[PDB]
Specification:
The PDB classes it as ribosome. The structure is cut from a larger assembly and holds chains A, B, C, D and E. Chain D is of the alpha+beta class. In chain D, about 15% of the residues lie in helices and about 40% in strands. By secondary structure, chain E is α+β, with helices and mostly antiparallel strands. Chain E has helices spanning about 35-50, 100-115, 140-145; strands spanning about 10-15, 30-35, 60-65, 75-85, 90, 95-100, 125-130. Classes of the chains: A mainly beta, B alpha+beta, C mainly alpha, D alpha+beta, E alpha+beta. The interface between B and C is medium-sized, with 24 and 20 residues. Chain C binds 3 RNA strands through helix 1, helix 2, helix 5 and helix 8.
RNA sequence: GCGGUGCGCCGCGACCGGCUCCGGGACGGCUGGGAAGGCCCGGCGGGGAAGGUGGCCCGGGGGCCCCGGGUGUUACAGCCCA
RNA sequence: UGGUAAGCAGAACUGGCGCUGCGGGAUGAACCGAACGCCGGGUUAAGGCGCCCGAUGCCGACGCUCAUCAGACCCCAGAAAA
RNA sequence: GCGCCGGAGCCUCGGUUGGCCUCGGAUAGCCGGUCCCCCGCCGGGGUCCGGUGCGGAGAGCCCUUCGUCCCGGGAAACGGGGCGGCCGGAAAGGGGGCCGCCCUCUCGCCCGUCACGCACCGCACGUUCGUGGGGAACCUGGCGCUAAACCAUUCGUAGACGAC
């Protein structure tokens, strides 16, 4: 019926200043604005869902145009409730400031 | 304009820090921006407390400016502060905030279904009252 | 899904710091009443800082030089532009999303405007310190449309007031159409009350 | 340091009545009403007793700069009481050597024009501030008389007339000529 | 030194290692307001080398234990005597603070000397710390709290936790 | 079926071990064999003084009500000594 | 050491650059941190944490200061007597 | 062959996964209710009464849906659904309010009975705004419209050439 994923804004890459490391991604999950509010989301699965030109087979039914890069929340990042995540192939940099889905189902409740 | 004053013996509701949620009786003023407060009947051990971390109420319990804990426990139990505190609208909407936070998934389903029907009946009577608002002149 | 920020009583850099980061995080921000924006320090000082900005033009051809935009919206817009990588695409795609307006235009007159309390003059200045309005600063440094904006914003203040009055009237009728219904929503309210939604 | 409390009270006479609206003080009485808005000064104004005979101004946790803004307010409201009961009147006298000062009142007291100052053909138009009325004392050689309620309007209007008459590119130790504030009083005597 | 956190009062007693000329050298005591024992024992040797001809290698530290406050729930006045280095000469001061602990009043003193005079931990010497009566204080910033029927409001309560919404509908209240 | 090597492609789970970052409990030692504090206003005796409670005089706030000052050591509050 | 002084000329000692990237100092042969095979996890140094720009969006502590030329970090990048 | 409307296909671009329709504003003060009073075309003063760590609270509010058949109870009739006119909108006009009738149920909301539906045999891009945006084309209906620009020629208020 309704939505089954929290909304994480892909902020940008794991980086210093003059040196970024693309293997880790920094997520900003909406609502959670502290380090003592982000224990729940540690270990959860993340999806960058996009759609592209060609048809790609779907697990569960018909070949659609939609595609995924599955990730995983690893750590808390800094003092004001941001999150490190890591994806099966590195996320594309066109995705910066775009929506990715924080799932619930490596569930700990 | 000011009605609530930092006095010797005014109660003050601590908002954040260690004892967030309890009531302390301001005993003595250390400096401009820190105070000495006692909360025996409310489980606050006597200590120094900053003025920033207290939202002060409107109860005054009267004792000298350096009395020990026995005589502020006396004045608390006498003046009946902890029972009079729960009477206030303040303590009632504090009590309500925690219940809404505590609310379960099944409780969230039950509250949705009751509010729906409360809204539906108010949506009727407000429109039936705007008939007698309209027809008096027009 | 659009932020409609009011600008009445907010400080230039304080507000522009939060608008710059929120619009880099993919939001669409709309800052209405850009002339209400305050600046810390007295008026004379703030005017002197703008006139110093005016003097900086390209010596050989001012057609290429720094464009000294004068409307309070465009002053604020350049102040947000300062806090962005505007020479790169994600800095341009950010500025594209920000929209600014002198007074309040029509789609946003009939909306509730949010307030940033982290960038608000009452809570970030002392009550004793001096400050200057971006609207008056714009007018004295060569803005033309201060006289028109005052009368047009006074017109919607009259319209919105009459509306607000008509909403007070609806609330008193909901206030009456609950108290007449006291006998038949006494069961429904109880399970709202025990979950702290009406105490 | 930060002084815990600085207070000063104004003792109000019977025939006037002060009304408080936040920091706006309204003084009504025999010969008019005066409103002054003190929203810039940041103090607690309070109105005590029956008849409302007394006005407090309190400043809590103010440093030496802010503690100066108390006797100021008590002095303003005292002049506001004096201006509503007894009024104000600033007598200005004309001094010259050769060329007399011809004083002509136009627009029923609001305007006054200054004729033959130091043999000038140029005739000076100075208007008074709203609620100040000019007049000439009868068979007194040269003295103007401003009358009004507000001290800050009557004084500024008298300063406009004094600064209007200036001796440019000359010695101001020789040519002492001009219209100077002789004596500051009230309209009605006590 | 570097006055990190709240300081602690230490009782550091010391004496010269006995030689042949004197087998019983006299014991000397000192009050060291310092972050811990390891700095308290170094600042002991600083003051001991300046008053006496006694050194670290020419002596031993007999006892260095933390002095506790005997009434940390009473509000006291603390008159402190100073000796600090300006950018031209050295100056002695007398400074009153109002606190429950002496070590709190000495930390409060180090912050006030740092704030007003730009004087740092290595510069400041503390010679005398005495708790005073309410009638024996010459400074108006500390005396004004000698009022048994004290009353003041909390006038302009600036809103803290500004970034809790960050995006509110209403303007915040100041009058409470 | 018992052993060996593998998955056509895309996926998930479980337990074991190494390295890590954390969270929650519970036990004990020392000190001035902690400093204060709480409960018997601990009960007794004597003192002392002020950020002075009772008791009284002042200026004032009303139809007789609380303030600010004076006096001084227990009273219808209390604090610190030996 | 010579010269009024010099991003000047000439010495002693140890360390650097030259022969050498890396993180910080916006920028820079020499400063500060630390020296490098190709990678994943962890954590630090010296510096940071309004936005650019990773990190204070802590309900951080105590003061100081208003500048019609404020002030704002080794080397260091513009000041004195009064 | 063009526009204004009344089927089934294709390419290609992507983001998205419920809505908030609004006082003005003060911050050493606010907010909502009241009757005596003067301006003004039903506002806005003094007056009384609540509330104020904002509860007529953005820490908020509104919506809320697995679907269908049976019987009841509560709650609706002054209701739900779609028709032609009745009145507005200019700072970047904006899709709404209200009545009749042409209009058809008696369902819809909330407690309780009654059985059902690929019960797809532990598993991933689920569920939306979507009759989205942009373009080549094919149908089947109506209603409508038949123009101008540039070159070429001429001019000389213009002019290197263009341009004018």
């Amino acid at each position: 019926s309704g939505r089954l994923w929290c909304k994480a804004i892909f902020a940008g890459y794991k980086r210093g200043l003059r040196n970024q490391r693309e293997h880790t991604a920094l997520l900003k999950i909406e609502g959670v604005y502290a380090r003592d509010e982000t224990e729940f989301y540690l270990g959860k699965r993340c999806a960058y869902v996009y759609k592209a030109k060609n048809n790609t087979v779907t697990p569960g039914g018909k070949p659609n145009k939609t595609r995924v890069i599955w990730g995983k929340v690893t750590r808390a990042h800094g003092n004001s409730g941001m999150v490190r995540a890591k994806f099966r192939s590195n996320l594309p940099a066109k995705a910066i400031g775009h929506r990715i889905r924080v799932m619930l189902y490596p569930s700990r409740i | 304009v000011f009605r609530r004053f930092v006095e010797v013996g005014r109660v003050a509701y601590v908002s954040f820090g260690p004892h967030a949620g309890k009531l302390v009786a301001i005993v003595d003023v250390i400096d401009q921006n820190r105070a000495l407060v006692d909360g025996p009947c409310t489980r606050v051990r006597r200590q120094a407390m900053p003025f920033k971390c207290m939202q002060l109420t409107d109860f005054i319990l009267k004792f000298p400016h350096s009395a020990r804990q026995k005589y502020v426990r006396k004045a608390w139990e006498k003046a009946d502060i902890n029972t009079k505190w729960a009477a206030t609208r303040w303590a009632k909407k504090i009590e309500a905030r925690e219940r809404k936070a505590k609310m379960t998934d099944f409780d969230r389903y039950k509250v949705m279904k009751a509010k729906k029907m409360r809204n539906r009946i108010i949506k009727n009577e407000v429109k039936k009252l705007q008939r007698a608002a309209l027809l008096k002149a027009s | 899904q659009v932020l409609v920020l009011d600008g009445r009583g907010h400080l230039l850099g304080r507000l522009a710091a939060i608008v710059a980061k929120q619009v880099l995080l993919g939001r669409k921000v709309v800052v209405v009443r850009c002339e209400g924006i305050n600046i810390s320090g007295n008026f004379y000082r703030n005017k002197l800082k703008y006139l110093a900005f005016l003097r900086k033009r390209m010596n050989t051809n001012p057609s290429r030089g720094p464009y000294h935009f004068r409307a309070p919206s465009r002053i604020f817009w350049r102040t947000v532009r300062g806090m962005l990588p505007h020479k790169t695409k994600r800095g341009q795609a950010a500025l594209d999303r920000l929209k600014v307006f002198d007074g309040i235009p029509p789609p946003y007159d009939k909306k509730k405007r949010m307030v940033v309390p982290a960038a608000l003059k009452v809570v970030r200045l002392k009550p004793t310190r001096k400050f200057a309005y971006l609207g008056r600063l714009a007018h004295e440094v060569g803005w033309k449309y201060q006289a028109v904006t005052a009368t047009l914003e006074e017109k919607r203040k009259e319209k919105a007031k009459i509306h607000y009055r008509k909403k007070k009237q609806i609330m008193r009728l909901r206030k009456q159409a609950e108290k007449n219904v006291e006998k038949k929503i006494s069961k429904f309210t109880e399970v709202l009350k025990t979950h702290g939604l009406l105490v | 340091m930060k002084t815990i409390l600085s207070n000063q009270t104004v003792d109000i006479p019977e025939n006037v009545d002060i009304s408080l609206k936040g920091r706006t003080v309204i003084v009504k009485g025999p010969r008019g009403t005066l409103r002054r808005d003190f929203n810039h000064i940041n103090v607690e104004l309070s109105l005590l007793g029956k008849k409302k005979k007394r006005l407090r101004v309190d400043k809590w946790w103010g440093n030496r700069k802010e503690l100066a803004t108390v006797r100021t307010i008590c002095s303003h409201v005292q002049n506001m009481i004096k201006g509503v009961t007894l009024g104000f009147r600033y007598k200005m006298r004309s001094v010259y050597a050769h060329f007399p000062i011809n004083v002509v009142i136009q627009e029923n007291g609001s305007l006054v024009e200054i004729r033959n100052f130091l043999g000038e053909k140029y005739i000076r138009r100075v208007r008074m501030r709203p609620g100040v009325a000019c007049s000439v004392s009868q068979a007194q050689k040269d003295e103007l008389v401003l009358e009004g309620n507000d001290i800050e309007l009557v004084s500024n209007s008298a300063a406009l007339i004094q600064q209007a008459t200036t001796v440019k590119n000359k010695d101001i130790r020789k040519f002492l000529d001009g219209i100077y504030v002789s004596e500051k009083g009230t309209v009605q005597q006590a | 030194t570097k006055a990190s956190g709240t300081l602690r009062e230490y009782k550091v007693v010391g004496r010269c290692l006995p030689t042949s000329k004197s087998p019983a050298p006299p014991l000397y005591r000192m009050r060291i307001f310092a972050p811990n024992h390891v700095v308290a024992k170094s600042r002991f040797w600083y003051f001991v080398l300046e008053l006496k001809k006694m050194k670290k290698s020419s002596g031993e530290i007999v006892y260095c234990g933390q002095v506790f406050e005997k009434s940390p729930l009473r509000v006291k006045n603390f008159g402190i005597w100073l000796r600090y280095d300006s950018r031209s000469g050295t100056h002695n001061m007398y400074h009153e603070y109002r606190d429950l602990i002496m070590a709190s009043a000495v930390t409060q003193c180090y912050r006030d000397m740092g704030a007003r005079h730009r004087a740092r931990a290595h510069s400041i010497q503390v010679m005398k710390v005495e708790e005073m009566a309410a009638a024996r204080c010459p400074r108006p910033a500390v005396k004004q709290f000698h009022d048994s029927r004290i009353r003041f409001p909390l006038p302009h309560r600036v809103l803290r936790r500004q970034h809790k919404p960050r995006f509110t509908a209403k303007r915040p209240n100041t009058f409470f």
